[PDB]
Design a protein around this ligand. Sequence first.
Ligand code: CL
Length: 334
Amino acid sequence: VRDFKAKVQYFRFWCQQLAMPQHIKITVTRKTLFEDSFQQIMSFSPQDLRRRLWVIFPGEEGLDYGGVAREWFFLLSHEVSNPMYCLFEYAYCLQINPASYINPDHLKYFRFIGRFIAMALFHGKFIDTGFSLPFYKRILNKPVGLKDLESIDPEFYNSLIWVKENNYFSKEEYIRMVAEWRLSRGVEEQTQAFFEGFNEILPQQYLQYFDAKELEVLLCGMQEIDLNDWQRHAIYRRYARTSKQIMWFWQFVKEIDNEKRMRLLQFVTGTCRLPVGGFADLMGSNGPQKFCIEKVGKENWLPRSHTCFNRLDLPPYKSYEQLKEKLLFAIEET
Ligand SMILES: [Cl-]
């Protein structure tokens, strides 16, 4: 069985060989946070950035050193997507802006953001922004293909899908090559710079036992899911809140631990992250889209998801134990 908590413990154990004594001061203002952070983080050696972080906002004599570092990670993670910098753009989910090259020092900023993300993982701090699953796979050095495209470029996915579901640039290799290329298309230099910054703080091989979804949880934190909020803002197709399978689904959600609930949330929606307003504000690819459970096929069918529409295709299972066994397997798959 896959055990996230064990993987994190082994990850911490490995990070000890990189741990350094004492602290480093990071002096940043709230007005010019992004730029002060850039000059501060880039002025230190990787080895020094592995010492305890002492983030300081001049004028603020905050005794809560931990609270200020958490705040700096939260605030800086929001600045990563600021259009004024033209580094990352929305596609919570971020992607490298291909127009970033307009600033001739753009690769230095990607090296900086790379250090920042590796620092969050190294210091056990969460960020309030995130990336796509194919990009988490890239951080882990895991291969990416056609399945990873559906969530990033649906039109391109469907055209590549037509080459597979039917019969000139040097089929299975081509479709795989094209998919890989599309995922880092026109952002290859920025990506390489990001990884240079990332690897000097935390070699990406320290994360080798995690899958992409676990890495997202590690960067977000295992936030406690409000079960009542989830239930009040869940909609149904060919089912009702009084249906046996639905009542078993909610029983299954109460039974599993919070890591399993996040894994279920990632299975249905593609992310463990929730909007600030909760389940009512869930967004799909075509507009607002609340978590939806649909009755599909028969008892022998496996559970399926349509992450673009935050939709679970739940077969009409015979027992609660059949529902528990089929969903656990469906959400575990990597
Ligand atoms: Cl993965």
